[PDB]
Ligand SMILES: C[C@@H](OP(=O)(O)OP(=O)(O)OP(=O)(O)OC[C@H]1O[C@@H](n2cnc3c(=O)[nH]c(N)nc32)[C@H](O)[C@@H]1O)c1ccccc1[N+](=O)[O-]
Ligand SMILES: C[C@@H](OP(=O)(O)OP(=O)(O)OP(=O)(O)OC[C@H]1O[C@@H](n2cnc3c(=O)[nH]c(N)nc32)[C@H](O)[C@@H]1O)c1ccccc1[N+](=O)[O-]
Ligand SMILES: [Mg+2]
């Protein structure tokens with residue numbers, strides 16, 4: 001079976017979201033080679049999923065998941081350009097995820113969606129406490145991988 | 148505010164899915180100009196949504212939602228080509244939805260995803276009884292409208 005190998009960004013909830021496999025919210029503190037899960041729109045697939053926040057180029061075999069909106073975590077741009085180095089390609093399947101859209105004092109969503117447009121990818125807001133958007137990420141990245 | 152004007156296909160649950168606005172399942176029998184709803188990934192939008200199953204060209208102002216998998220409802224192809232006549236365009240924001248993926252004796256999902264690829268759009272399976280996929284449709288069509 002097809003292997004949906006897809007988590008990246010700055011330091012500050014990349015884990016929590018992936019913690020889809022665990023259906024529960026970590027407020028706790030593992031972040032290095034860290035998941036597998038057995039359908040999406042009726043196609044039966046496995047996933048290989050979490051990076052921490054130099055050369056470990058090594059791992060980006062990869063779709064990319066790639067900030068949490070109370071933090072103007074500029075840093076996405078960086079990630080995205082390091083992958084265009086290794087991957088060597090101006091299009092690689094990918095989702096811009098704004099996490100922690102639950103919280104009050106926050107990044108106004110437009111900003112992002114206009115960068116999103118400027119890379120030409122998904123932009124999906126998301127929240128591992130409330131679940132709101134957890135899987136919306138993952139599952140639109142798969143469907144990408146038309147690629 | 149931006150107006151997310153998006154339901155189409157053959158006769159045989161286009162309504163039920165739209166019935167997002169009503170969060171409940173119709174097994175009952177209205178199908179002609181039939182919804183509005185006030186966020187998606189943190190962008191605050193309204194929707195204007197249901198067609199029945201000649202010239203009423205009139206309505207496809209439109210994103211297109213466009214079969215229910217126990218019915219080999221061939222008919223998507225037709226829809227999709229009538230819109231490339233009116234809309235005049237080989238790319239128009241759009242989601243291929245396989246509805247009623249709940250049911251037992253069913254269209255094998257691959258088939259579709261390979262047509263999907265062959266048009267270059269989303270293909271999302273979906274189910275208004277179980278909710279599974281209701282909003283997955285709607286909300287990925289919006290994000291399309293990068294267009
Ligand atoms: C070491 C490095 O760790 P890191 O691995 O770079 O950090 P992660 O990106 O994995 O982030 P993690 O999933 O550990 O969650 C971080 C914190 O934000 C909270 N959080 C995550 N998602 C949400 C959400 O949607 N809502 C809310 N309200 N909070 C959320 C978590 O519960 C947690 O307290 C790291 C670097 C800098 C700062 C922290 C940090 N860390 O791991 O704590
Ligand atoms: C007149 C024309 O009507 P139509 O408007 O072309 O038909 P719709 O596409 O709007 O279809 P509708 O939403 O009315 O649902 C049709 C039937 O399939 C069921 N259904 C819809 N979604 C699901 C689902 O995900 N799961 C299950 N198990 N069943 C589902 C409904 O509960 C209902 O009994 C029409 C044409 C032909 C046949 C029927 C038909 N009709 O309206 O009944
Ligand atoms: Mg971590």
Ligand SMILES: [Mg+2]
Pocket residue numbers: 161162177178197198199
């Ligand atoms: Mg109807």
